[PDB]
From a paper:
We report the functional characterisation of a modified sugar-binding protein, MsBP, from a marine Synechococcus strain, MITS9220. Ligand screening of MsBP shows a specific affinity for zinc (KD ~ 1.3 μM) and a preference for phosphate-modified sugars, such as fructose-1,6-biphosphate, in the presence of zinc (KD ~ 5.8 μM). The presence of the additional C-terminal subdomain places it unambiguously within sub-cluster D-I, associated with a narrow substrate preference for carbohydrates.
The structure of Zn-MsBP showed a single chain containing two Zn2+ atoms in the asymmetric unit (a.s.u). Notably, the structure of Zn-MsBP shows ten molecules of SO42−, possibly sequestered from the sulphate rich crystallisation condition (2 M (NH4)2SO4, 20% w/v PEG3350). One Zn2+ atom (Zn #1) appears at the periphery, weakly held within a negatively-charged cavity of the crystal lattice, created by the side chains of amino acids, such as D87 and T89, from two neighbouring monomers. The second Zn2+ atom (Zn #2) is located within the binding pocket of the protein. However, candidate sidechains in the vicinity include S174, Q227 and R228. The fourth coordination for this zinc may be satisfied with the carboxylate group of D173. This zinc is held peripheral to the binding cleft of the protein and is within 4 Å of the aromatic sidechain of W49, positioned over the binding cleft. Two sulphate ions are positioned in the positively-charged binding cleft: one adjacent to the bound Zn2+ (SO42− #9), and the second buried deeper within the cleft (SO42− #8). In Zn-MsBP, helix 2 is pushed ~ 10 Å over the binding cleft, attenuating access to the substrate-binding channel. The observed partial closure of the binding pocket for Zn-MsBP, caused by the movement of helix 2 exposes a hydrophobic patch to solvent, and positions W49 to occlude the entrance to the cleft, closely positioned to the bound Zn2+. Thus, from the ‘partially-closed’ conformation of the Zn-MsBP structure, it is inferred Zn2+ may modulate ligand binding, consistent with an induced-fit mechanism.
Author numbering: 10 to 410
The structure:
Protein backbone atom coordinates (compact mmCIF):
# COMPACT_ATOMS: atom_id res chain seq x y z
CA UNK A 1 0.00 0.00 0.00
CA UNK A 2 3.09 2.22 0.39
CA UNK A 3 5.31 2.93 -2.62
CA UNK A 4 8.97 3.72 -1.88
CA UNK A 5 11.32 4.72 -4.70
CA UNK A 6 15.10 4.95 -4.22
CA UNK A 7 16.52 6.99 -7.10
CA UNK A 8 20.08 6.31 -8.25
CA UNK A 9 20.87 4.43 -5.05
CA UNK A 10 24.08 2.41 -5.11
CA UNK A 11 23.34 -1.36 -5.19
CA UNK A 12 25.83 -1.71 -2.32
CA UNK A 13 23.22 -0.15 0.00
CA UNK A 14 20.64 -2.79 -0.99
CA UNK A 15 20.96 -5.27 1.91
CA UNK A 16 20.21 -2.39 4.29
CA UNK A 17 16.82 -1.63 2.71
CA UNK A 18 15.83 -5.26 3.28
CA UNK A 19 16.88 -4.81 6.93
CA UNK A 20 14.96 -1.58 7.58
CA UNK A 21 11.94 -2.36 5.42
CA UNK A 22 12.01 -5.66 7.27
CA UNK A 23 11.69 -3.74 10.53
CA UNK A 24 8.92 -1.53 9.13
CA UNK A 25 6.99 -4.52 7.76
CA UNK A 26 6.94 -6.48 11.03
CA UNK A 27 6.17 -3.25 12.90
CA UNK A 28 3.38 -2.32 10.45
CA UNK A 29 1.91 -5.48 8.90
CA UNK A 30 -1.03 -3.49 7.51
CA UNK A 31 1.18 -0.94 5.66
CA UNK A 32 3.81 -2.95 3.80
CA UNK A 33 6.33 -1.10 1.64
CA UNK A 34 6.64 -1.88 -2.07
CA UNK A 35 10.26 -0.93 -2.76
CA UNK A 36 11.17 0.15 -6.30
CA UNK A 37 14.85 0.74 -7.09
CA UNK A 38 15.94 3.07 -9.91
CA UNK A 39 19.73 2.84 -10.21
CA UNK A 40 21.75 4.57 -12.92
CA UNK A 41 20.90 3.26 -16.39
CA UNK A 42 17.31 2.16 -15.68
CA UNK A 43 15.93 5.47 -14.40
CA UNK A 44 14.31 6.54 -17.69
CA UNK A 45 13.05 2.98 -18.22
CA UNK A 46 11.37 2.82 -14.81
CA UNK A 47 10.00 6.37 -14.58
CA UNK A 48 8.36 6.11 -18.00
CA UNK A 49 6.70 2.84 -17.00
CA UNK A 50 5.31 4.63 -13.94
CA UNK A 51 4.04 7.44 -16.17
CA UNK A 52 2.23 4.89 -18.35
CA UNK A 53 0.64 3.34 -15.23
CA UNK A 54 -0.29 6.66 -13.57
CA UNK A 55 1.41 5.52 -10.36
CA UNK A 56 3.63 7.62 -8.11
CA UNK A 57 5.73 7.03 -4.99
CA UNK A 58 4.59 7.96 -1.51
CA UNK A 59 8.21 8.50 -0.40
CA UNK A 60 11.22 9.22 -2.63
CA UNK A 61 14.73 10.59 -2.17
CA UNK A 62 15.91 13.86 -3.72
CA UNK A 63 18.67 16.42 -3.35
CA UNK A 64 17.57 19.91 -2.24
CA UNK A 65 18.11 21.76 -5.54
CA UNK A 66 16.20 19.01 -7.38
CA UNK A 67 13.36 18.97 -4.83
CA UNK A 68 12.94 22.74 -5.17
CA UNK A 69 12.67 22.34 -8.95
CA UNK A 70 9.93 19.72 -8.63
CA UNK A 71 8.32 21.85 -5.91
CA UNK A 72 8.03 24.73 -8.38
CA UNK A 73 5.55 22.67 -10.43
CA UNK A 74 3.45 21.81 -7.36
CA UNK A 75 4.49 18.16 -7.18
CA UNK A 76 5.62 17.89 -3.55
CA UNK A 77 3.69 18.10 -0.30
CA UNK A 78 4.47 20.78 2.27
CA UNK A 79 5.16 18.60 5.31
CA UNK A 80 5.07 21.19 8.11
CA UNK A 81 1.41 20.41 8.80
CA UNK A 82 1.90 16.62 8.72
CA UNK A 83 4.89 16.48 11.08
CA UNK A 84 4.44 15.44 14.72
CA UNK A 85 5.62 18.03 17.25
CA UNK A 86 9.29 17.69 18.12
CA UNK A 87 10.45 16.07 14.88
CA UNK A 88 12.36 19.08 13.54
CA UNK A 89 14.34 19.14 16.80
CA UNK A 90 15.84 15.70 16.09
CA UNK A 91 17.80 16.94 13.05
CA UNK A 92 20.76 19.24 12.56
CA UNK A 93 19.19 22.71 12.20
CA UNK A 94 21.49 23.82 9.38
CA UNK A 95 20.57 20.64 7.49
CA UNK A 96 16.86 20.85 8.30
CA UNK A 97 16.82 24.41 6.96
CA UNK A 98 18.60 23.35 3.77
CA UNK A 99 15.65 21.07 2.96
CA UNK A 100 13.31 24.09 3.17
CA UNK A 101 12.27 25.68 -0.11
CA UNK A 102 11.73 29.40 0.64
CA UNK A 103 8.67 29.33 -1.64
CA UNK A 104 7.18 25.89 -0.91
CA UNK A 105 8.01 25.13 2.75
CA UNK A 106 9.38 21.92 4.21
CA UNK A 107 9.22 19.85 1.02
CA UNK A 108 11.48 17.06 2.32
CA UNK A 109 13.02 15.56 5.46
CA UNK A 110 16.82 15.24 5.79
CA UNK A 111 18.29 11.76 5.43
CA UNK A 112 22.05 11.14 5.20
CA UNK A 113 24.70 13.69 4.27
CA UNK A 114 28.33 13.54 3.18
CA UNK A 115 31.11 16.10 3.64
CA UNK A 116 33.31 15.19 0.69
CA UNK A 117 37.06 15.34 1.30
CA UNK A 118 40.11 15.76 -0.94
CA UNK A 119 41.39 12.27 -1.75
CA UNK A 120 44.99 13.00 -2.73
CA UNK A 121 46.99 10.58 -4.88
CA UNK A 122 50.24 11.01 -2.96
CA UNK A 123 52.12 9.23 -5.75
CA UNK A 124 51.39 11.70 -8.55
CA UNK A 125 51.93 14.48 -6.00
CA UNK A 126 55.56 13.49 -5.41
CA UNK A 127 56.04 12.88 -9.14
CA UNK A 128 55.35 16.62 -9.57
CA UNK A 129 57.71 17.83 -6.83
CA UNK A 130 55.10 18.70 -4.19
CA UNK A 131 54.87 17.84 -0.49
CA UNK A 132 51.67 19.57 0.63
CA UNK A 133 48.37 19.41 -1.23
CA UNK A 134 46.34 22.57 -1.92
CA UNK A 135 43.63 23.59 0.53
CA UNK A 136 42.28 26.86 -0.96
CA UNK A 137 41.21 27.42 -4.57
CA UNK A 138 43.90 30.11 -4.77
CA UNK A 139 46.50 27.33 -4.50
CA UNK A 140 44.93 25.21 -7.27
CA UNK A 141 46.26 26.79 -10.52
CA UNK A 142 49.90 26.31 -9.52
CA UNK A 143 49.16 22.80 -8.25
CA UNK A 144 47.40 21.96 -11.52
CA UNK A 145 50.42 23.31 -13.41
CA UNK A 146 52.93 21.11 -11.58
CA UNK A 147 50.85 17.94 -11.96
CA UNK A 148 50.03 18.38 -15.65
CA UNK A 149 53.40 19.63 -16.92
CA UNK A 150 55.80 17.66 -14.71
CA UNK A 151 53.84 14.36 -14.72
CA UNK A 152 51.52 14.39 -17.75
CA UNK A 153 48.50 13.56 -15.58
CA UNK A 154 45.65 15.89 -14.65
CA UNK A 155 45.42 17.48 -11.22
CA UNK A 156 41.65 17.63 -10.80
CA UNK A 157 38.31 16.97 -12.50
CA UNK A 158 35.11 19.01 -12.10
CA UNK A 159 32.36 18.52 -14.67
CA UNK A 160 30.86 21.43 -16.60
CA UNK A 161 27.95 19.40 -17.99
CA UNK A 162 24.83 21.55 -17.52
CA UNK A 163 22.71 18.86 -15.82
CA UNK A 164 25.28 17.01 -13.67
CA UNK A 165 26.97 17.71 -10.34
CA UNK A 166 27.00 21.16 -8.75
CA UNK A 167 30.56 20.82 -7.42
CA UNK A 168 31.59 23.56 -9.85
CA UNK A 169 28.62 25.72 -8.87
CA UNK A 170 29.56 25.14 -5.22
CA UNK A 171 33.10 26.37 -5.90
CA UNK A 172 31.57 29.67 -7.03
CA UNK A 173 29.83 30.05 -3.66
CA UNK A 174 33.02 29.19 -1.78
CA UNK A 175 34.94 31.84 -3.75
CA UNK A 176 32.44 34.40 -2.46
CA UNK A 177 29.98 34.47 -5.39
CA UNK A 178 26.28 34.95 -4.66
CA UNK A 179 24.10 33.31 -7.29
CA UNK A 180 20.68 34.90 -6.69
CA UNK A 181 19.48 37.98 -4.82
CA UNK A 182 16.22 38.45 -2.90
CA UNK A 183 14.14 39.14 -6.04
CA UNK A 184 15.54 35.93 -7.61
CA UNK A 185 17.65 38.03 -9.99
CA UNK A 186 21.23 37.34 -11.05
CA UNK A 187 23.83 38.28 -8.43
CA UNK A 188 27.02 36.84 -9.97
CA UNK A 189 27.87 39.78 -12.27
CA UNK A 190 30.34 40.92 -9.62
CA UNK A 191 34.13 41.10 -9.21
CA UNK A 192 34.00 37.78 -7.33
CA UNK A 193 31.93 36.16 -10.08
CA UNK A 194 34.07 37.38 -12.96
CA UNK A 195 37.09 35.91 -11.16
CA UNK A 196 35.31 32.56 -10.85
CA UNK A 197 34.34 32.35 -14.53
CA UNK A 198 37.89 33.26 -15.56
CA UNK A 199 39.49 30.96 -12.97
CA UNK A 200 38.02 27.92 -14.72
CA UNK A 201 38.29 29.36 -18.23
CA UNK A 202 42.04 29.82 -17.73
CA UNK A 203 42.59 26.35 -16.26
CA UNK A 204 40.97 24.68 -19.27
CA UNK A 205 42.60 26.81 -21.98
CA UNK A 206 45.98 26.40 -20.27
CA UNK A 207 45.37 22.66 -20.60
CA UNK A 208 45.46 21.90 -16.87
CA UNK A 209 42.03 20.19 -16.89
CA UNK A 210 40.91 17.03 -18.71
CA UNK A 211 39.19 17.78 -22.00
CA UNK A 212 36.28 15.57 -20.91
CA UNK A 213 35.17 17.93 -18.11
CA UNK A 214 32.92 19.60 -20.70
CA UNK A 215 31.48 16.34 -22.11
CA UNK A 216 31.28 13.89 -19.18
CA UNK A 217 30.12 14.11 -15.58
CA UNK A 218 31.67 13.48 -12.19
CA UNK A 219 31.52 9.70 -12.67
CA UNK A 220 34.52 10.12 -14.99
CA UNK A 221 36.53 11.73 -12.18
CA UNK A 222 36.06 8.52 -10.19
CA UNK A 223 37.14 6.42 -13.18
CA UNK A 224 40.24 8.56 -13.69
CA UNK A 225 41.27 8.46 -10.03
CA UNK A 226 40.94 4.66 -9.92
CA UNK A 227 43.13 4.50 -13.03
CA UNK A 228 45.85 6.45 -11.22
CA UNK A 229 45.33 9.20 -13.81
CA UNK A 230 43.97 11.84 -11.41
CA UNK A 231 45.84 13.46 -8.53
CA UNK A 232 42.87 14.67 -6.44
CA UNK A 233 39.26 13.52 -6.15
CA UNK A 234 36.38 15.00 -4.16
CA UNK A 235 34.82 12.09 -2.26
CA UNK A 236 35.01 10.34 1.11
CA UNK A 237 35.22 7.14 3.10
CA UNK A 238 32.78 4.88 1.24
CA UNK A 239 34.51 5.32 -2.12
CA UNK A 240 37.90 4.96 -0.43
CA UNK A 241 36.73 1.55 0.80
CA UNK A 242 35.81 0.48 -2.74
CA UNK A 243 39.33 1.33 -3.94
CA UNK A 244 40.83 -0.94 -1.27
CA UNK A 245 39.27 -3.84 -3.21
CA UNK A 246 39.04 -2.37 -6.73
CA UNK A 247 42.40 -0.97 -7.84
CA UNK A 248 44.37 -1.16 -4.58
CA UNK A 249 47.73 0.54 -4.49
CA UNK A 250 45.91 3.60 -5.70
CA UNK A 251 44.28 3.24 -2.27
CA UNK A 252 47.59 2.53 -0.53
CA UNK A 253 48.73 5.83 -2.06
CA UNK A 254 45.62 7.89 -1.22
CA UNK A 255 45.39 10.07 1.88
CA UNK A 256 42.21 11.95 2.89
CA UNK A 257 42.66 15.69 3.38
CA UNK A 258 40.33 18.60 4.17
CA UNK A 259 38.36 19.72 1.11
CA UNK A 260 39.21 22.65 -1.10
CA UNK A 261 37.57 25.54 0.73
CA UNK A 262 37.08 29.24 -0.05
CA UNK A 263 38.79 32.10 1.83
CA UNK A 264 36.05 31.75 4.48
CA UNK A 265 36.89 28.08 5.10
CA UNK A 266 33.38 26.65 4.69
CA UNK A 267 33.27 23.24 3.02
CA UNK A 268 30.21 21.83 1.26
CA UNK A 269 27.59 19.39 2.54
CA UNK A 270 25.83 16.99 0.17
CA UNK A 271 22.33 16.38 1.52
CA UNK A 272 19.97 13.52 0.70
CA UNK A 273 16.33 14.12 1.66
CA UNK A 274 13.01 12.28 1.56
CA UNK A 275 9.95 13.90 -0.01
CA UNK A 276 6.25 13.04 -0.24
CA UNK A 277 4.56 13.78 -3.60
CA UNK A 278 1.28 15.66 -3.37
CA UNK A 279 -0.42 12.95 -5.48
CA UNK A 280 -0.46 10.65 -2.45
CA UNK A 281 -3.53 9.60 -0.45
CA UNK A 282 -1.40 8.19 2.41
CA UNK A 283 0.59 11.37 3.04
CA UNK A 284 0.37 10.97 6.82
CA UNK A 285 1.49 7.35 6.58
CA UNK A 286 4.15 8.41 4.07
CA UNK A 287 5.50 10.96 6.55
CA UNK A 288 5.50 8.22 9.19
CA UNK A 289 7.63 6.09 6.86
CA UNK A 290 9.99 8.98 6.11
CA UNK A 291 10.45 9.73 9.82
CA UNK A 292 11.06 6.03 10.50
CA UNK A 293 13.73 5.72 7.80
CA UNK A 294 15.35 8.87 9.22
CA UNK A 295 15.27 8.18 12.96
CA UNK A 296 18.29 7.84 15.22
CA UNK A 297 18.43 4.05 15.21
CA UNK A 298 18.12 3.59 11.45
CA UNK A 299 20.30 6.60 10.61
CA UNK A 300 23.02 5.27 12.93
CA UNK A 301 22.89 1.90 11.17
CA UNK A 302 23.10 3.47 7.71
CA UNK A 303 25.85 5.92 8.64
CA UNK A 304 27.96 2.91 9.66
CA UNK A 305 27.21 0.60 6.73
CA UNK A 306 27.41 3.37 4.11
CA UNK A 307 30.15 5.26 5.99
CA UNK A 308 28.24 8.54 5.73
CA UNK A 309 27.02 11.04 8.32
CA UNK A 310 23.45 11.09 9.68
CA UNK A 311 21.19 14.12 9.93
CA UNK A 312 19.90 12.97 13.34
CA UNK A 313 21.68 14.75 16.18
CA UNK A 314 21.40 11.59 18.29
CA UNK A 315 22.86 9.28 15.64
CA UNK A 316 25.53 11.86 14.83
CA UNK A 317 26.87 11.97 18.39
CA UNK A 318 26.77 8.16 18.44
CA UNK A 319 28.85 7.94 15.25
CA UNK A 320 31.36 10.45 16.64
CA UNK A 321 31.73 8.52 19.89
CA UNK A 322 31.96 5.29 17.88
CA UNK A 323 34.92 6.82 16.02
CA UNK A 324 36.80 8.41 18.93
CA UNK A 325 36.82 4.97 20.56
CA UNK A 326 37.79 3.20 17.33
CA UNK A 327 41.40 1.95 17.45
CA UNK A 328 42.36 0.25 14.17
CA UNK A 329 45.21 -2.11 13.34
CA UNK A 330 45.31 -2.37 9.54
CA UNK A 331 46.62 0.84 7.91
CA UNK A 332 43.54 0.58 5.66
CA UNK A 333 41.10 0.62 8.58
CA UNK A 334 42.93 3.71 9.83
CA UNK A 335 42.59 5.24 6.37
CA UNK A 336 38.81 4.73 6.37
CA UNK A 337 38.61 5.84 10.00
CA UNK A 338 40.69 8.93 9.21
CA UNK A 339 38.22 9.88 6.47
CA UNK A 340 35.05 9.51 8.54
CA UNK A 341 36.57 11.58 11.35
CA UNK A 342 37.66 14.26 8.87
CA UNK A 343 34.15 14.55 7.45
CA UNK A 344 32.67 14.45 10.96
CA UNK A 345 34.98 17.14 12.36
CA UNK A 346 34.71 19.21 9.17
CA UNK A 347 30.91 19.15 9.50
CA UNK A 348 31.06 21.97 12.06
CA UNK A 349 32.22 24.57 9.51
CA UNK A 350 30.36 22.90 6.62
CA UNK A 351 27.15 24.13 5.01
CA UNK A 352 24.84 23.21 2.13
CA UNK A 353 26.09 25.78 -0.38
CA UNK A 354 23.34 24.98 -2.90
CA UNK A 355 20.16 24.31 -0.89
CA UNK A 356 16.53 23.86 -2.00
CA UNK A 357 16.51 27.15 -3.90
CA UNK A 358 13.96 27.37 -6.74
CA UNK A 359 15.57 27.97 -10.12
CA UNK A 360 19.12 27.24 -8.96
CA UNK A 361 19.28 23.92 -10.82
CA UNK A 362 18.10 25.79 -13.92
CA UNK A 363 20.66 28.52 -13.24
CA UNK A 364 23.33 25.81 -13.06
CA UNK A 365 22.60 24.72 -16.63
CA UNK A 366 22.75 28.35 -17.79
CA UNK A 367 26.10 29.00 -16.10
CA UNK A 368 27.75 25.75 -17.20
CA UNK A 369 26.69 26.28 -20.82
CA UNK A 370 28.15 29.77 -21.20
CA UNK A 371 31.17 28.66 -19.17
CA UNK A 372 31.74 25.79 -21.62
CA UNK A 373 31.72 28.28 -24.50
CA UNK A 374 34.26 30.40 -22.62
CA UNK A 375 36.77 27.60 -21.99
CA UNK A 376 36.28 26.32 -25.55
CA UNK A 377 37.44 29.67 -26.93
CA UNK A 378 34.14 30.84 -28.43
CA UNK A 379 33.69 33.78 -26.01
CA UNK A 380 35.45 35.41 -23.07
CA UNK A 381 34.90 34.79 -19.37
CA UNK A 382 33.62 38.34 -18.84
CA UNK A 383 31.35 37.78 -21.85
CA UNK A 384 30.11 34.46 -20.45
CA UNK A 385 29.13 36.26 -17.24
CA UNK A 386 26.99 38.83 -19.06
CA UNK A 387 25.41 36.26 -21.37
CA UNK A 388 24.49 34.09 -18.38
CA UNK A 389 23.08 37.06 -16.46
CA UNK A 390 20.98 38.26 -19.41
CA UNK A 391 19.74 34.73 -20.11
CA UNK A 392 18.78 34.07 -16.49
CA UNK A 393 17.13 37.43 -15.78
CA UNK A 394 15.19 36.85 -19.01
CA UNK A 395 13.73 33.70 -17.44
CA UNK A 396 13.27 35.07 -13.91
CA UNK A 397 11.37 38.06 -15.31
CA UNK A 398 8.60 35.67 -16.43
CA UNK A 399 8.76 33.10 -13.61
CA UNK A 400 8.79 35.77 -10.86
CA UNK A 401 7.34 38.89 -12.56
ZN1 LIG B 1 5.78 26.17 5.49
ZN1 LIG C 1 27.35 13.62 -12.02
Amino acid sequence: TLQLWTLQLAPKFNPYMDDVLGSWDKLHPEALVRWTDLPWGSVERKLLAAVFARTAPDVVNLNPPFAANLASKGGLTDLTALLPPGAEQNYLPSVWEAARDPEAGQIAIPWYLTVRLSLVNGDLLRQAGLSRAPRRWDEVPAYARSIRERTGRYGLFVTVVPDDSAELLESFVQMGVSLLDARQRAAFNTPAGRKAFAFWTDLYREGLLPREVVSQGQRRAIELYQSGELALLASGAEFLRSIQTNAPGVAAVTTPQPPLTGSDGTANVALMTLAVPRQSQQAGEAVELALFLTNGTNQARFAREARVLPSSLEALSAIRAELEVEQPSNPAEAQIRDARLLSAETLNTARVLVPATPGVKRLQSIIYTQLQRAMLGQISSDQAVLEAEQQWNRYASARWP
